[PDB]
């Protein structure tokens, strides 16, 4: 068990510990990992690669600005992914592609202006998504995939994503073609 964590069974919790980096001794048998309310601002590439049995990963309330490419690729059993209340300015192409079992993905309260096209397409088990409190860029070509995807997957949205500037719903926007 890592120094600032509490390990109960295969559940690893290291919340509100003023952590500045991901703990180094996380066992590979971990099924749940929570690193909430710390001081993380970045993540090393491949940092969670050995945590293949993880069903839940939560990094809410930190100051992460970007994600390493393929940072979630080895976490194929992930059912819950919380990334809200951070400072994300963008998402890597297909970062969620290998998560075919993901049910919950929280991305609210960050600094996202846009997301890559088709970023949620592979999420076949998705039930809930949080996208609110982000300065979405509702200019057209850019917001086209999101407004459309949000409209079709209406029932999964927790809260309501709003356009930066006008405050209008991202789903109220229809792009030109």
CATH code at 117? 3.80.10.10
Residue-wise over 64-83: b if at least 16 C-beta within 10 A, else e? bebbeebbbbbbebbebbbb
Question: Residue 72 in 3-state DSSP?
Answer: coil
Closest CA to 67 of 98, 96, 33, 34: 96
**Domains: count for the chain:** 1
Torsion of CA 15, 20, 25, 28, to 10 degrees: 70
CA distance 73 to 149: 23
Distances (CA, A) of 65 to 15, 33, 108: 19, 20, 13
What experimental approach yielded this model? X-ray
Range of the domain at 152: 1-177
93 alpha carbon, distance to own chain's centre = 13
């Amino acid at each position: 068990c890592p120094s600032r964590c509490s390990c109960s069974g295969t559940e690893i919790r290291c919340n509100s510990k003023g952590l500045t980096s991901v703990p180094t001794g996380i066992p590979s048998s971990a099924t749940r990992l929570e690193l909430e309310s710390n001081k993380l601002q970045s993540l090393p590439h491949g940092v969670f690669d050995k945590l293949t049995q993880l069903t839940k990963l939560s990094l809410s309330q930190n100051q992460i600005q970007s994600l390493p490419d393929g940072v979630f690729d080895k976490l194929t059993k992930l059912t819950i992914l919380y990334l809200h209340e951070n400072k994300l300015q963008s998402l890597p192409n297909g970062v969620f592609d290998k998560l075919t079992q993901l049910k919950e993905l929280a991305l609210d309260t960050n600094q996202l202006k846009s997301v890559p096209d088709g970023i949620f397409d592979r999420l076949t088990s998705l039930q809930k998504i949080w996208l609110h409190t982000n300065p979405w860029d509702c200019s057209c070509p850019r917001i086209d995939y999101l407004s459309r995807w949000l409209n079709k997957n209406s029932q999964k949205e927790q809260g309501s994503a709003k356009c930066s500037g006008s405050g209008k719903p991202v789903r109220s926007i229809i792009c030109p073609t």
